[PDB]
Amino acid sequence: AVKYLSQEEAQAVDQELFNEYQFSVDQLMELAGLSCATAIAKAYPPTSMSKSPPTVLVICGPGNNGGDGLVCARHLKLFGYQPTIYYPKRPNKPLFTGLVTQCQKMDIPFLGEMPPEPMMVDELYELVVDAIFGFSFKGDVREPFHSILSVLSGLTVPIASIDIPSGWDVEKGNPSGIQPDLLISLTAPKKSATHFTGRYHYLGGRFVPPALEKKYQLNLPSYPDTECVYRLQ
Amino acid sequence: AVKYLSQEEAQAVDQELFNEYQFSVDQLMELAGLSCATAIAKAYPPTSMSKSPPTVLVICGPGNNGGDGLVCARHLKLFGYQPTIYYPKRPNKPLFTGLVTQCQKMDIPFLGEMPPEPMMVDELYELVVDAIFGFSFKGDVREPFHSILSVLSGLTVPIASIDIPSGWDVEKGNPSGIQPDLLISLTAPKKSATHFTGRYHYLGGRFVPPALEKKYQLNLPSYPDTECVYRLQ
Numbered sequence: 283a284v285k286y287l288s289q290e291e292a293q294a295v296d297q298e299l300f301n302e303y304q305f306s307v308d309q310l311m312e313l314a315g316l317s318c319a320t321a322i323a324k325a326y327p328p329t330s331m332s333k334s335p336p337t338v339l340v341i342c343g344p345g346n347n348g349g350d351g352l353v354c355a356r357h358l359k360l361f362g363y364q365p366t367i368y369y370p371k372r373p374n375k376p377l378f379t380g381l382v383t384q385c386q387k388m389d390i391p392f393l394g395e396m397p398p399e400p401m402m403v404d405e406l407y408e409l410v411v412d413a414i415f416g417f418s419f420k421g422d423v424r425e426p427f428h429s430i431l432s433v434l435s436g437l438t439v440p441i442a443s444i445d446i447p448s449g450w451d452v453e454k455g456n457p458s459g460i461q462p463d464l465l466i467s468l469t470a471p472k473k474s475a476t477h478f479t480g481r482y483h484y485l486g487g488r489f490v491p492p493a494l495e496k497k498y499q500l501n502l503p504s505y506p507d508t509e510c511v512y513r514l515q
Numbered sequence: 516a517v518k519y520l521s522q523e524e525a526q527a528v529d530q531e532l533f534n535e536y537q538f539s540v541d542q543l544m545e546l547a548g549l550s551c552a553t554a555i556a557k558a559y560p561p562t563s564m565s566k567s568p569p570t571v572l573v574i575c576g577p578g579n580n581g582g583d584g585l586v587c588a589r590h591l592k593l594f595g596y597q598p599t600i601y602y603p604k605r606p607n608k609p610l611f612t613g614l615v616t617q618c619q620k621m622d623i624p625f626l627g628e629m630p631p632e633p634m635m636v637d638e639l640y641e642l643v644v645d646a647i648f649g650f651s652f653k654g655d656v657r658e659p660f661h662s663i664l665s666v667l668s669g670l671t672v673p674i675a676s677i678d679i680p681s682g683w684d685v686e687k688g689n690p691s692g693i694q695p696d697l698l699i700s701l702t703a704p705k706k707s708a709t710h711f712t713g714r715y716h717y718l719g720g721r722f723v724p725p726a727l728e729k730k731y732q733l734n735l736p737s738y739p740d741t742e743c744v745y746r747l748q
């Protein structure tokens with residue numbers, strides 16, 4: 283049975299990865315983003331969708347979860363989805379400026395505003411990716427994300443969350459928060475994951491050294507062959 | 516029919532990727548390395564091998580092909596191979612120091628010398644990955660790579676080459692050079708690829724924007740589902 287990580291633990295593992303093992307931030311994010319794009323394509327394959335190419339809104343927050351979202355948007359386009367991104371708060375750091383340019387030149391469009399009504403999102407986007415807040419959230423949630431989350435909580439189309447459903451307390455969840463259909467837990471699941479009631483839970487981020495998985499007793503499942511995702515439960 | 520690129524063309528496409536599209540070097544290398552690890556696992560799956568875990572020597576050169584090799588070693592270990600690396604000439608740049616530490620802490624060992632006789636390599640390593648020179652080679656080939664290539668040309672176990680078989684002229688090949696069993700062409704094949712006579716030719720590096728594939732008329736095949744490799748011919 284895979285370990286579900288405290289916020290303490292998750293912070294520690296993440297910090298080993300960057301300092302002790304010296305993975306660069308972009309390397310880990312590229313693998314995370316790919317895992318996400320991959321989970322989405324397995325859960326919601328293109329052939330199984332009414333639109334062709336199937337359309338997807340990726341909503342990216344102001345830190346690393348946002349960046350996973352950018353990577354994810356990009357691999358989705360390659361897997362034959364048609365993504366659109368909303369990215370309202372963009373850290374001005376080469377990592378993020380690069381990701382934005384990549385998507386831009388992939389003709390992945392960045393909206394200037396969130397569609398203000400649940401219905402409009404529903405009509406335009408067959409699936410929505412919540413790439414807003416991640417495991418290091420505390421929060422608490424400022425604008426424009428409060429009003430964004432609030433639009434999301436009224437959607438009828440599925441939500442895919444990266445790592446944590448944004449708006450949820452990282453260990454305790456949130457009974458009134460958003461309720462996604464797919465959760466991609468990166469590295470290993472966080473304790474908020476026990477409150478998850480969607481259909482698809484996937485593990486992603488196939489880059490965890492054995493020595494580290496042992497040290498924290500993560501008990502990761504065996505990813506099949508060369509896959510970067512594993513369907514849990 | 517996929518385009519086979521001149522060295523001119525390949526240099527140009529590569530430079531669009533980094534300048535115009537602003538992919539960072541590590542992002543592209545992580546995807547390349549993964550493609551390689553993946554081609555190897557599909558061509559030589561673990562179950563199909565006499566040793567368990569199956570063993571692999573990754574020989575890494577002094578530039579980017581070397582770095583793809585480091586990434587590749589690492590994903591191989593994750594896919595259940597047991598790799599060993601020989602990396603004699605290491606650029607002292609954070610990118611490469613990071614890759615070395617990652618592998619080190621994965622318990623992937625870096626040999627201090629090349630086993631000097633073809634037979635010793637054969638007895639220890641079921642497969643050898645040629646991660647030495649890449650598409651920007653001119654060369655010409657200095658030590659210790661000359662004596663290395665020379666050891667390789669006497670092997671009985673298969674060779675997997677990344678992008679180009681090292682020692683070959685990038686467009687014209689090399690009749691007396693090494694003769695690999697697997698070639699992983701990254702991005703798109705180079706003209707040396709027409710001289711390839713091994714069994715496995717895979718395309719890798721699933722990150723080519725449509726606008727760029729169109730501008731250079733690469734005519735890439737369709738990668739299946741969420742795969743990062745495609746078997747050619």
Ligand SMILES: Cc1c[nH]c(=O)[nH]c1=O
Pocket residue numbers: 292293295296314416417445468469470
């Ligand atoms: C440990 C860790 C690293 N990176 C993530 O995105 N999530 C995690 O839980």
Ligand SMILES: Cc1c[nH]c(=O)[nH]c1=O
Pocket residue numbers: 525526528529547649650678701702703
């Ligand atoms: C265009 C190009 C980029 N990167 C590579 O490794 N090989 C290539 O041919």
